[PDB]
Amino acid sequence: GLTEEQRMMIRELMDAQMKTFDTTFSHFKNFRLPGVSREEAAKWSQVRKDLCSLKVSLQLRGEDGSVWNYKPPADSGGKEIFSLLPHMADMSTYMFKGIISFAKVISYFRDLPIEDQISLLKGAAFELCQLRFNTVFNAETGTWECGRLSYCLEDTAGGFQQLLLEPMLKFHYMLKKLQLHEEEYVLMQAISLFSPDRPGVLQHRVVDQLQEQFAITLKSYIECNRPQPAHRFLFLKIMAMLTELRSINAQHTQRLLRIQDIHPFATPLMQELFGITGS
Amino acid sequence: GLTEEQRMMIRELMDAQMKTFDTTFSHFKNFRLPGVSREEAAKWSQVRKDLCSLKVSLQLRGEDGSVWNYKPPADSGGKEIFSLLPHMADMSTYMFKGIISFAKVISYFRDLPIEDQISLLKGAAFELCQLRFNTVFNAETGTWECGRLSYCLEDTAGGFQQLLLEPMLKFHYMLKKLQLHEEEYVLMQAISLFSPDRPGVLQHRVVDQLQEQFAITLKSYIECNRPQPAHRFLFLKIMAMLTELRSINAQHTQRLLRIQDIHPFATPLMQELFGITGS
Ligand SMILES: C#C[C@]1(O)CC[C@H]2[C@@H]3CCc4cc(O)ccc4[C@H]3CC[C@@]21C
Ligand SMILES: C#C[C@]1(O)CC[C@H]2[C@@H]3CCc4cc(O)ccc4[C@H]3CC[C@@]21C
Ligand SMILES: ClC1=C(Cl)[C@]2(Cl)[C@@H]3[C@@H](Cl)[C@H](Cl)[C@@H](Cl)[C@@H]3[C@@]1(Cl)C2(Cl)Cl
Ligand SMILES: ClC1=C(Cl)[C@]2(Cl)[C@@H]3[C@@H](Cl)[C@H](Cl)[C@@H](Cl)[C@@H]3[C@@]1(Cl)C2(Cl)Cl
Numbered sequence A, B: 001g002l003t004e005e006q007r008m009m010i011r012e013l014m015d016a017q018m019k020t021f022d023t024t025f026s027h028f029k030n031f032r033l034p035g036v037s038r039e040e041a042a043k044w045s046q047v048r049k050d051l052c053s054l055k056v057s058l059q060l061r062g063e064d065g066s067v068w069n070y071k072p073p074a075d076s077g078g079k080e081i082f083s084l085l086p087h088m089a090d091m092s093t094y095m096f097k098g099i100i101s102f103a104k105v106i107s108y109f110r111d112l113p114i115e116d117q118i119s120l121l122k123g124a125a126f127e128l129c130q131l132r133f134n135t136v137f138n139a140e141t142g143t144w145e146c147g148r149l150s151y152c153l154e155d156t157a158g159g160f161q162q163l164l165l166e167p168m169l170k171f172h173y174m175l176k177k178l179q180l181h182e183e184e185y186v187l188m189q190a191i192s193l194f195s196p197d198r199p200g201v202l203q204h205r206v207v208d209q210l211q212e213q214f215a216i217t218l219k220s221y222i223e224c225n226r227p228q229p230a231h232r233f234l235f236l237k238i239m240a241m242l243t244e245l246r247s248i249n250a251q252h253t254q255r256l257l258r259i260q261d262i263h264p265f266a267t268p269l270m271q272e273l274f275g276i277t278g279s
Helices: A004-020 A038-051 A085-105 A114-135 A159-163 A167-177 A182-193 A204-225 A234-262 A268-274 B004-020 B038-051 B085-105 B114-135 B159-163 B167-177 B182-193 B204-225 B234-262 B268-274
Strands: A056-061 A067-071 A143-146 A149-153 B056-061 B067-071 B143-146 B149-153
Touching: A004 A085, A004 A182, A004 A204, A038 A234, A085 A114, A085 A268, A114 A167, A114 A182, A114 A234, A114 A268, A167 A234, A182 A204, A182 A234, A204 A234, A234 A268, B004 B085, B004 B182, B004 B204, B038 B234, B085 B114, B085 B268, B114 B167, B114 B182, B114 B234, B114 B268, B167 B234, B182 B204, B182 B234, B204 B234, B234 B268
Parallel strands: none
Antiparallel strands: A056 A067, A056 A149, A067 B067, A143 A149, B056 B067, B056 B149, B143 B149
């Protein structure tokens, strides 16, 4: 069974999720939409490869029942590969705010020194974003269902299996297949958030002990509520997914910074979280 | 055969069409797009009936290869029925300018007094718009193909036959089925433009004689270039379509003014041409 402290812990995390996760994306508005040198040469080639590796179309369902649909352009060696970047920057920025709010509502987080709060959020914001995004992911239709917005994966030559070579996409399908509870998602967010080895963390003995407690609570939760053979080793699978998410976080940070280098687009909040300084 | 004067006449009309018809709609830009009392009660009911009687979705093909698609809302008793009005006002305004330019390039038109020019354009602008729109109408797919913009008729319960109850739509299908030449379309535009019985025309003996000459030139053109049994009575069918277009013009003017009464949207050029004064 769960100890009282373990029940309190889950309770406070679920409370924080409830207050700060706009699951219908109702308050996401005023966002942008797509319009209607050998060293440099190597930079663009890489960014081009990075960008086309994850193509989505976009749908907007109006409250009135109207539907707008956007199919992205092909790469034709020009700036059209950047068409969805302002929009995506706005969406991630919106998600990041929710995630910052999530963190601030948690007592264990508030109690850390401010410099560590910042270091942990800089370290985990993206990961907590992916974790929240997975809960609105539809693995049957390859679509992230964000209230009135949908982001639908473009077909490719190898269909599912091939698009699934992309680590971000493999991560989303694999996590969704685990069929996690809300409680388990939010404990994943805590474990990722309270990671002792993020750049700049000072109170890392504290953070490490906090992390260990969230992990023990998760292991205990699974043991108390999931007896089926399907869920044998579920706790270890989740921890393995969390390690993988940190790898993905590192890869995508590098992509971001590679795009940013040749085509600036990061919002001010994005710059803050990813260490772009404005100069 | 055609007399020299008849060849000159067609030549000058075709010249005017060539210079003033943006057939790829390349210069149509900066247009608006849909966003992302018992006496009054009777007004809205009528306007609602008027508006839903011709529903189109809209597609925009970007030069980069991107595609935007808009599916209109259902009537739910609110202002959503007006969603495409600003856009359509911008498109018609764009077409009207081309049509005004067309008229001004024609010697027979320039030679009329200015007050008659204005009276003829007020009378015929809409009709010449429909005539030009028919040349980019695709009767197989029920779409008006305006370069990178397409306007596609929405499906309904009776399919083609039922949507074809709408006089505007019946007119477009019937005219397209006649498979007219460019020359014949532009002579239709001249006959409509030079109509002696538009409100306010003063030199109507002149205009009537001008109109009669364009009609004789058209009859002669058909007789010289169309011997097939399919085209027997083609000249009379065209004149019957022109009479029908004037009926449509009267109906649609009333719809326009009915919408305008309860929901103003007409551009300044629209107001000028339809006699809305600004007060
Ligand atoms: C390059 C590249 C990509 O693989 C396709 C689009 C890129 C994202 C664009 C938006 C965005 C926003 C962030 O806050 C952080 C990263 C990104 C980019 C990550 C790499 C992506 C998915
Ligand atoms: C009401 C109604 C309708 O049948 C559907 C949309 C209406 C048009 C909107 C744009 C427009 C522009 C013009 O310059 C003149 C008329 C109109 C309206 C005509 C009636 C329409 C087709
Ligand atoms: Cl997830 C995910 C979503 Cl969602 C989109 Cl729209 C975008 C957000 Cl804005 C950032 Cl946070 C992340 Cl890296 C990406 C991806 Cl992989 C896509 Cl391109 Cl699908
Ligand atoms: Cl034709 C024709 C076209 Cl085109 C559209 Cl988009 C619109 C123009 Cl802007 C005005 Cl001029 C005319 Cl009345 C209408 C219709 Cl019937 C539709 Cl709603 Cl299809």
